[PDB]
Nucleic acid binder design. Sequence first.
RNA 1: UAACUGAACGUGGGCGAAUGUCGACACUAGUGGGCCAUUUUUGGUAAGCAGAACUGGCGAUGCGGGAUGAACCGAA
RNA 2: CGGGACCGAGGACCGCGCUCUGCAAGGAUGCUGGCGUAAUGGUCACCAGCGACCCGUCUUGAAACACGGACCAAGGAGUCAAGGUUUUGCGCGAGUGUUUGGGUGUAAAACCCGCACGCGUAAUGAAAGUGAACGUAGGUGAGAGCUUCGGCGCAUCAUCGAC
Lengths: 150, 141, 146, 108, 52, 36
Amino acid sequence: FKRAEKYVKEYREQEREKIRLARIAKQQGSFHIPAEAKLVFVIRIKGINKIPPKPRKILQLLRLRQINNGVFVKVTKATAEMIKIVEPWVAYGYPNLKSVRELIYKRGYGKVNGQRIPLTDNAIIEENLGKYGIICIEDLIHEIFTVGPN
Amino acid sequence: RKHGQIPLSTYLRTYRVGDIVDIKVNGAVQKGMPHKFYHGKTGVVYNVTKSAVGVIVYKRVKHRYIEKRINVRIEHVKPSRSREDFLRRVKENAELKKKAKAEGVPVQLKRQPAMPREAHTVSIADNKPVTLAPVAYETTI
Amino acid sequence: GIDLVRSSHRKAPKSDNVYLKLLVKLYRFLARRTEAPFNKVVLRRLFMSRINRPPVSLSRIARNLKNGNEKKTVVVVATVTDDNRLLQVPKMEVAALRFTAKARARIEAAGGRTLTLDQLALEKPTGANTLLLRGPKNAREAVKHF
Amino acid sequence: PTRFSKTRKHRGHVVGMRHFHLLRNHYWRPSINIDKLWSLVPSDVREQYLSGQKKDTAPVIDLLSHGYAKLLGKGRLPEIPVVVRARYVSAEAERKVKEAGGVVELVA
Amino acid sequence: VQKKNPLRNKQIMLRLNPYASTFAKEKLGEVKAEEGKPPKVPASFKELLHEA
Amino acid sequence: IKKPKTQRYPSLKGTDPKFRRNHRHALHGTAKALKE
RNA sequence: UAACUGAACGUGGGCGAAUGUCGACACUAGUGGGCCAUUUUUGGUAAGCAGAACUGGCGAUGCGGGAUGAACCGAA
RNA sequence: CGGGACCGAGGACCGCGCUCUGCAAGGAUGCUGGCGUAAUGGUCACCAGCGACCCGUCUUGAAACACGGACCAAGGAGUCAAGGUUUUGCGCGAGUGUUUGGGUGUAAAACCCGCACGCGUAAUGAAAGUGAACGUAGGUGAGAGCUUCGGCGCAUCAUCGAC
């Protein structure tokens, strides 16, 4: 409860802080360049027919083996080259908080012992990710959205 | 490589077993020359002899790799800078981790790839932007 | 469509021996309800075929009985075989699937004890102080032609 | 059995020199090693000899009666004197018998 | 036996997130901005914006 | 084309016989030193 | 090596980019100088065309769309 | 905050929870009506909408061509012996194999018996011939299991030795 309260406060403060920095730069007669995005959401929208081996291997390593499969991906140069290679099969972009929380609430499934278990209770998340400090669904959403150390 | 005299610091480089060496064949010296293949290849020293060294190369034939042991004179071998980025790094982690453990504060000690840049503010004063057309106007002149 | 393996080991013995089925049931219960890996290894070897269970001789046991292994209980999931080249059989407590008549006679004459695997399960259910031995797998004319 | 066959399942989907007149009985010379020499003794008497109940008696073994012509020398022998009567013997087997304390006697 | 959507069944929402009731009660999705008269746009900004 | 497995200790078969003989004598000496 | 000066190998002690997540045998096969196409490349022709390398498809394959269909598009 | 469609899997309790006398919280119950039979359901025949080339074989990379097919019933094509090889089950195990034969019998069965012999237990060389322990049957690195927690270390693999 306290952790979710802190997370909501942090999200609101980050939004107003970005707006405030842009406004003070505009008022001082300059331009505030916002930070480049750290989180991307990649969706494979093309089928599995007639695909070259290198894009097939990269789509396999991105865990996109089916059309309409989506993954949360950290933005880095080493990953961005792979995504640039598999651009003719995927659509990617920068998701927001509602996208992240709606995805993990509605289609949230975890890999527990090699099995696809729905995220219906916080006990599963605490059992499989509690060593990293992620004990509930709000920590999972916060880690995905803010791109934490885990 | 220029024609004539060979530089003499080639003979003053000391090779030991386990060192990583390139093979750059010198055309002037015909003794100890390897094949047409194994030129421009990187390998491991296993045997050190008076004027030659033994290099472990992994040749490819069909659908498998075969180990080859090639005897090459010191004329055609050059020290390879592949693992200098490893040795300097592992030394640097050794003293940095010793210092960080002594001090107390944990650090990020793995090399990280290029992350996206953070937010910053760019001043307009004395750097006023110039307006560009799709073509240059002095070019349309 | 999606762009994407059975096991390659025995899960039940191919034999129809009812006594072997009883032993399999007992060691299945032991391997399920105990934490000892010895029970699982004995169950896996009980599953195996005859060519995967070569015989273990008395000289082979006497070799492994040395170096502080004299009082350990020898466990061999195979047939224990007599060796005429071993003149003096040391005192040994052996649990096995089968004993040849001369090997059993020589063990009991030397003063040791012959056990079956159910007796081994009763006396040492966790396989404590046991020496688990196997015979030479590659000692066949079939294997030598491979 | 025919019913266990694959056909029933597929029902519907189809140097040196030459030796003229060689007699194999000339080269009948079976060999026994010394590590199997004590197995020719009967079991009770063998256990008495190996346990030392017999100290004034030495066993005599005829290899021809058991069907062996040569005594070979693979293995070790205990320190018990044995008389071994053989048609052939190797040098190492003869040596090992003499540090065992016995003797190899040649027969025909 | 049945996966229920937290965005539709509010009981699962309060099971997974006990702060949802406090969020809805305190109206944290309707937080107004801070008060104060906003400064006007600098003239140089509009001149650069409408520069040909 | 997978990379072939490499043994932990390469043989002294490839090396020169003088250093091979010296290394075998050194191994015998360190063996007796370890046994002591 | 002028030299415990080095060379290997041991004795003891202390301490590392991203993303995703098996090996060896036994026995038994069918196919191993086929067709089409994108890209690259070498020769040419009046025009055709003839060759090589990689990849994809077909032969082995249904479905939706090209009115229809071995080689097209989507999708298995 | 309404309007609509499809679905109701499970079967005492357990669990996560909440707005906590209870509940929309680990899967539908409550009330009511008609009928209680060809009414629901099913089979066959036919109409209607949509879909739908004649099966084999051959060819080649494939299609076409070519070949066979008037119809029906019955028959009709990877079998047995010998010798190898790998694997599965079994008996005995450094041995093993009674059944050439003999004894016996309720008589081609079953039961019993042994000499020889085959294969295995020793290889190598054209042959004469010779013929497998320096060592707890060796050292090193792995290695399941066990351990008094120091280590012992099966199979097996790599390597250096010995006969």
